[PDB]
């Protein structure tokens, strides 16, 4: 399967250079264009640039002076650099496969011409002169350039959350949330993990290394007055399994390359 995986720092300090990498699989970079896109929290998608099969690069004109894209076909890797970042560069960054092809403004059997009376247009092949873009000779005028691109994104990466900030990284403290007696007396028991005081986003939680997915609710983080985040995850299990079965939450904080596995034992 065509697959795209972004990697790079989660936290970057202002004025520094953001360097991301996209590792691709299931195709050769020699044969497919790859692009970069970002979306800031609560804003619209923003095109960054792309690198074509031959290495030709194209960038968002407003950002071109700050961007650099390169690739290594043998490594199946594409890179992005964004120089002199500020907080407005905080965003989820996606790499993606790009299908782009040059198309003529006019269908086959037609020729593009700008010598026509009234503007540029499409003239039937065979027709001579400046009236050929008029209805009686089978042609028409157009405001489209001579050649355009059929452009779209085929597949997207999951995206990498990037926070620009002067604040240091802080990995979470993980506390097991044991199920109390009177709350488990109904058949199902809820146990959880408190993921406290971390920066920046994001944190992922799984239970028993992914073997436990049904009945897992991992909640969005709260942002504290201290500037640090906290979140919780909860899983519901049969109350008869408590004490017999081992339940472990796997808390991953990629910004600090740190993962914590905490056993949650019954009271």
């Amino acid at each position: 399967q065509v697959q795209l995986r972004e990697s790079g720092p989660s936290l970057v300090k202002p004025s520094q250079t953001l360097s991301l990498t996209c590792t691709v699989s299931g195709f050769s970079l020699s044969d497919k264009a790859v692009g970069w896109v970002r979306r800031a929290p609560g804003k619209a998608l923003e095109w960054l640039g792309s690198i074509d099969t031959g290495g030709m690069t194209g960038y968002n004109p407003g950002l071109k002076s700050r961007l650099s894209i390169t690739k290594d076909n043998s490594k199946s890797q594409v890179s992005l650099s964004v120089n002199s970042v500020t907080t407005e560069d905080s965003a989820t960054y996606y790499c993606a496969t790009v299908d782009q092809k040059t198309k003529n403004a006019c269908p086959d059997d037609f020729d593009y011409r700008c010598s026509c009376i009234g503007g540029c247009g499409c003239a039937r092949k065979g027709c001579v002169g400046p009236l050929c873009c008029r209805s009686d000779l089978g042609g028409y005028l157009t405001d489209s350039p001579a050649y355009i691109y059929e452009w779209y994104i085929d597949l997207w990466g999951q995206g990498l959350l990037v926070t620009v900030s002067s604040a240091s990284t802080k990995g979470p403290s993980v506390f097991p949330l044991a199920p109390s007696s009177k709350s488990t007396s109904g058949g199902t028991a809820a146990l959880g993990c408190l993921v406290k005081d971390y920066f920046p986003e994001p944190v992922t939680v799984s239970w028993n290394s992914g073997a436990l997915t049904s009945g897992v609710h991992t909640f969005p983080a709260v942002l504290q007055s201290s500037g640090l985040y906290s979140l919780s995850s909860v899983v519901t299990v049969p109350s008869s399994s408590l004490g017999t079965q081992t339940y472990i939450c796997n808390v991953n904080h990629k910004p600090s390359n740190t993962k914590v596995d905490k056993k949650v034992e019954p009271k």
Partner: protein, 211 residues
């Protein structure tokens, strides 16, 4: 930036349309594409070339264009369709793309649902760090509005409370959490604490005690 309505709404099983207005230098050239962005999932290509459905996209997603305005139409609307929808086109004669402003699709007609509430006392491990947090977890409610109140014994507690804004789950209901920060002695000095969650006028209360 191409012009899209900020928001559109439709009813379950009905049809909605989302418009995307540009100029002759982008949309007017054709080859508009459409993308579905659901939080927690990779962006998903729906439509390319004005009208062609991408792989895996069902026929209830359709695209069309008239001049400088392109339209996405979604029929047999499901709750799963709630998302942010973006159009895009290449610009002028370049491989550079311009995206739309984005449209948030809300699907109305979903059944109301009461919140499930779980309240956790401070863990022994946290108390050994000289801290105490009560965790009130609120899940599986619709619509996405709740209010949270905390009580120590019978008296309201307002300091030390932080509550998240509601966000949609993967099953299309809403979730929220509330945290009450206490000192270990405050925790131990009262006979109970309670999280009270109000939704559509009705309230559910959960209580935990130090013992």
């Amino acid at each position: 930036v191409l012009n899209q309505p900020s928001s559109v709404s439709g009813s379950l099983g009905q049809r909605v349309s989302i418009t995307c207005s540009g100029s002759s230098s982008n949309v007017g050239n054709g080859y508009v594409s459409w993308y579905q962005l659901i939080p927690g999932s990779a962006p998903r290509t729906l439509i390319y070339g004005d009208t062609s459905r991408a792989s895996g996209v069902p026929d209830r997603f359709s695209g069309s264009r008239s001049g400088n305005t392109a339209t996405l139409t979604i029929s047999s609307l499901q709750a799963e369709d709630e998302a942010d929808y973006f159009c895009a086109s290449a610009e002028d004669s370049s491989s550079n793309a311009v995206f739309g402003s984005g449209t948030t699709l809300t699907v109305l007609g979903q059944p109301k649902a009461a919140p499930s509430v779980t309240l956790f006392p401070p863990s022994s491990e946290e108390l050994q760090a000289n801290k105490a947090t009560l965790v009130c977890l609120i899940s599986d409610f619709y619509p996405g509005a709740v209010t949270v109140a905390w009580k120590a014994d019978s008296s309201p507690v307002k300091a030390g409370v932080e509550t998240t804004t509601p966000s949609k789950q993967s099953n299309n209901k809403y979730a929220a959490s509330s945290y009450l920060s206490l000192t270990p002695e405050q925790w131990k000095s009262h006979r109970s604490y309670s999280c009270q969650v109000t939704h559509e006028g009705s309230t559910v209360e959960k209580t935990v005690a130090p013992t």
